[PDB]
Amino acid sequence: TNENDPAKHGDQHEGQHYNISPQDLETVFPHGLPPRFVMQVKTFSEACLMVRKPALELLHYLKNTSFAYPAIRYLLYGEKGTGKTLSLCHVIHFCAKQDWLILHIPDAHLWVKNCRDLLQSSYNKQRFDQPLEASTWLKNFKTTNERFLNQIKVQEKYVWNKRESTEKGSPLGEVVEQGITRVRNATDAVGIVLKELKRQSSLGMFHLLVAVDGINALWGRTTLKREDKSPIAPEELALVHNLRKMMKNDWHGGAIVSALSQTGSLFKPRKAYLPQELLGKEGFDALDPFIPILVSNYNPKEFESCIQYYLENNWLQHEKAPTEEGKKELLFLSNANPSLLERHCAYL
Amino acid sequence: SRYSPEFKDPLIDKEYYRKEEKYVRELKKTQLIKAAPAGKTSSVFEDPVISKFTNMMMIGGNKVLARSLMIQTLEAVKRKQFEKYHAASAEEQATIERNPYTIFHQALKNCEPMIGLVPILKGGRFYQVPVPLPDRRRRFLAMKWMITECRDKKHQRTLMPEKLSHKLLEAFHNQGPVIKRKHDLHKMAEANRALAHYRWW
Amino acid sequence: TEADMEEYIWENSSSERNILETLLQMKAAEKNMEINKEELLGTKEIEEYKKSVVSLKNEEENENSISQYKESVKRLLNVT
Ligand SMILES: Nc1nc2c(ncn2[C@@H]2O[C@H](COP(=O)(O)OP(=O)(O)OP(=O)(O)O)[C@@H](O)[C@H]2O)c(=O)[nH]1
């Protein structure tokens, strides 16, 4: 049930649970969860994550990985309700313990859709602006990480419309504060710091890691429209174009991880979870090869271990449920689906 | 109506199925039987209380939304009880009850009044008179009163899940508008006592 | 163009990405051996990746096909 070694893991004991620290919650990943599960763990008041077979296999990949090889690309995909993104957060935890520069985004659905104010950029042309989300992710990355910002030492300058500029040998904490102070050019600040991360090709001072959730939103059309009642293409958006031009496998110093999510998929049908189906033709042309990782449903013993975890937490107040017929009907109606399992144990 | 009069409704308790009793069982075996409904199921996680609650809160035949909102409210009550447990000392946790199902049952059977007022005709004036009510009548009245005091235009902004969760936690120990108006109903009965003689049933 | 040719062909389309994906690793892993592109494409694992991409991208994909594609990428990039 419970595990005493949270950082290191093994295959021998599967379905185990390992506790984590509050500083690891608030510093490593304060954003990269669904708000449902965020509040769910807040109500837990006891942060314990479960081990997964594909998670351990991906960790084995990371353990057996050379950075002289090109930047490897991993894609997690489940059946719309598995633990793909939670295993991605587990990878984030492992790499943070490994002391790498991790940049993790909450979701790209929020980027491509639901912008309160879409703007002619001055740093470029033929490009809208995502200022609010830019500053949001900027302060998000600041909260995620500090010595890295202090020691980044950008070897290039950047002027600004605000009668100011930034010169060599300065830490990009100052551009982080720029974007947090004013949000208009925060999109340009983000699209510039992302390029600056790769501007250092050696990456000996740190090792770069990219973590993406809802990758399906990155490849696909937009719901936004132009004020003249005209559609908007995804590549026209500032952040979309920046990210697309940016993640290319050109830095070749580690790995990047992305996860699929159909719950927020737009212009796509229900009960569709195949990678090719989600990322489309343009996605396959963007990254023809990659490491697909199928995140299957819970195993039997892992399922019973999760039940025992809930019982130790006294999550199920229905005290006639801990019995053979109750468990049978429970996992029969659940079909080992983690999300509906969480829902059922929540409202039971 | 549709089903022939020969058909009868079956029961659901598999614990009652699996073993004069055998004589009535043989009579039922000889008799015919219709199809069971879609709402009721022999699973342990169901009861006619929540069945009636869903059927009452549902509107326009949106049973899926009704039950989703019901389970959302159950989760809300559960999280409130869990925060109570986490904040309370050990001795107070030993007393705090967390099961939202029992919380709901207690609130309902505390809100339920055992007497009502019936309008009776006298001359050219209708007068309210105290009358004992049946169990099903009291249950229906309490449920509808709870739901109608939960949903109201006074809290048009805040959301009905948390509204009714708070109302249930209030009525769990005889508090809230339902309880206060039940007390007012008892007062109205105490006022209209002497008119009891007007009832012939 | 590719939009007109609905059945892609392993002539230049995927080769554009494969040249980069191979040389970016050969510069370090191979120590600038400068192996010829046809000599690289004449190997067995590259043909297996070719036929995997064919079976996956041309017709309906399945769990076994996706597993074969995963193993193909793994054997090609020799990361294990
Ligand atoms: N404790 C624990 N819960 C898990 C694990 N894997 C899955 N779950 C449960 O399953 C739910 C789904 O996990 P997510 O990764 O957030 O779901 P998703 O990948 O966003 O799925 P979609 O976005 O709907 O496509 C979680 O909220 C958990 O309740 C696990 O490894 N440990």
Q: What is the DSSP string of A172-184?
A: THHHHHHHHH-ST
In terms of Cβ atoms closer than 10 Å to its own Cβ (0-12, 13-18, 19+), residue C38 is exposed
Comparing CA positions, the residue from A130, A105, A94 lying closest to residue A30 is A105
What approach was used to elucidate this structure? cryo-EM
CA distance A107 to A344: 25
* Contact partners, residue B21, CB within 8 Å, separation at least 6: none
* Contact partners, residue B28, CB within 8 Å, separation at least 6: B8
* Contact partners, residue A254, CB within 8 Å, separation at least 6: A65, A67, A71, A72, A100, A203, A207, A208, A209
* Contact partners, residue A240, CB within 8 Å, separation at least 6: A111, A112, A218, A234
CB A104 within 8 A of CB A85: no
Do residue A276 and residue C29 have CB atoms under 8 angstroms apart?
Answer: no
Find the DSSP H helices in B36-159: 48-57, 63-87, 90-95, 100-111, 135-150
- The owner of tokens 């709402």 is B39
CA A279 to chain centroid, in Å, comes to: 16
* Binding-site residues of A for GTP: 50, 78-85
Do residue A64 and residue C80 have CB atoms under 8 angstroms apart?
Answer: yes
Phi, psi of B122 (to 5 degrees): -140, 115
Resolution expressed in Å: 4.0
* Contact partners, residue C43, CB within 8 Å, separation at least 6: none
CB A77 within 8 A of CB A294: yes
Ligand 1 contact via A261 beta carbon (within 6 Å): yes
Q: Which amino acid is at A137?
A: W
CB contacts, 8 Å: B44 with chain A: 320-321, 325-326, 329
DSSP state of B67: H
CB B14 within 8 A of CB B36: no
Q: Which residues are A165's β-sheet partners?
A: A159
Ligand 1 contact via A15 beta carbon (within 6 Å): no
Atom 11 in ligand 1: residue holding the nearest Cα: A339
Do residue B83 and residue A318 have CB atoms under 8 angstroms apart?
Answer: no
CA distance A229 to C64: 45
CB crowding A315-341: b at 16 or more within 10 Å, else e: bbbeeebeeeebeebbbeebebbbbeb
* Contact partners, residue A42, CB within 8 Å, separation at least 6: none
CA distance A180 to A173: 10
Q: Rounded to a whole number, what is the distance in angstroms from the first to the last CA of chain A? A: 21
* Contact partners, residue A278, CB within 8 Å, separation at least 6: A77, A215, A216, A260, A262, A265, A268, A272
A-C contacts at Cβ under 8 angstroms: 54
Extract the tokens encoding A340.
Answer: 């509906």
Phi, psi of C61 (to 5 degrees): -95, 155
CA A35 to chain centroid, in Å, comes to: 13
Q: Is the CB of C63 inside 8 Å of chain A's CB atoms?
A: yes
Comparing CA positions, the residue from A296, A309, A305, A310 lying closest to residue A338 is A296
* Contact partners, residue C78, CB within 8 Å, separation at least 6: none
Residue C76: count of CB within 10 angstroms of its CB: 19
- The owner of tokens 């809300």 is B76
Comparing CA positions, the residue from B100, C21, C8 lying closest to residue A252 is C21
HSE-CB at A115 with a 13 A cutoff on CA atoms is 27
Ligand 1 contact via A109 beta carbon (within 6 Å): no
Comparing CA positions, the residue from A26, A27, A32 lying closest to residue A214 is A32
Extract the tokens encoding C13.
Answer: 């389309």
Distances (CA, A) of B194 to A159, A277, B127, B184, B191: 91, 77, 11, 17, 8
Task: Classify the phi-psi angles of B122: left when phi > 0, otherwise alpha if psi is within -120 to 50, otherwise beta.
Answer: beta
Question: Parallel, antiparallel, or unpaired: how do β-strands A225-226 and A17-19 relate?
Answer: unpaired
DSSP state of B114: S
Extract the tokens encoding B35.
Answer: 């199809």
Phi, psi of B142 (to 5 degrees): -60, -45
CA distance C42 to A235: 36
Task: Classify the phi-psi angles of A226: left when phi > 0, otherwise alpha if psi is within -120 to 50, otherwise beta.
Answer: beta
Distances (CA, A) of A29 to A38, A145, B121: 10, 10, 71
CB crowding A47-69: b at 16 or more within 10 Å, else e: ebbbbbebbbebbebbeeeebeb
* Contact partners, residue B166, CB within 8 Å, separation at least 6: none
Q: Nearest-5° angle of CA A141, CA A147, CA A148?
A: 55
Beta strands in chain A (DSSP E): 2-3, 17-19, 48-50, 72-77, 101-104, 158-160, 164-166, 208-212, 225-226, 230-231, 255-259, 291-294
CB B85 within 8 A of CB B79: no
After which residues, if any, is chain C broken (C to N > 2.5 Å)? none
CB A292 within 8 A of CB A327: no
Comparing CA positions, the residue from A264, A268, A239, A9 lying closest to residue A138 is A239
CA A10 to chain centroid, in Å, comes to: 24
Residues making up chain A, counted from first to last = 348
Residue A266 host element (H or E): none
HSE-CB at A72 with a 13 A cutoff on CA atoms is 22
HSE-CB at C46 with a 13 A cutoff on CA atoms is 15
Q: Which amino acid is at B134?
A: P
- Calculate the CA dihedral of residues B155, B156, B162, B166 and round it to 10 degrees: 20
**Per-window interface: C 5-34 vs A, CB < 8 A:** 14, 17-18, 20-21, 24-25, 28-29
Q: Nearest-5° angle of CA A227, CA A233, CA A236?
A: 90
Extract the tokens encoding B188.
Answer: 């109205």
Extract the tokens encoding A63.
Answer: 């353990």
Question: Parallel, antiparallel, or unpaired: how do β-strands A158-160 and A164-166 relate?
Answer: antiparallel
CB A254 within 8 A of CB A207: yes
Question: Parallel, antiparallel, or unpaired: how do β-strands A208-212 and A255-259 relate?
Answer: parallel
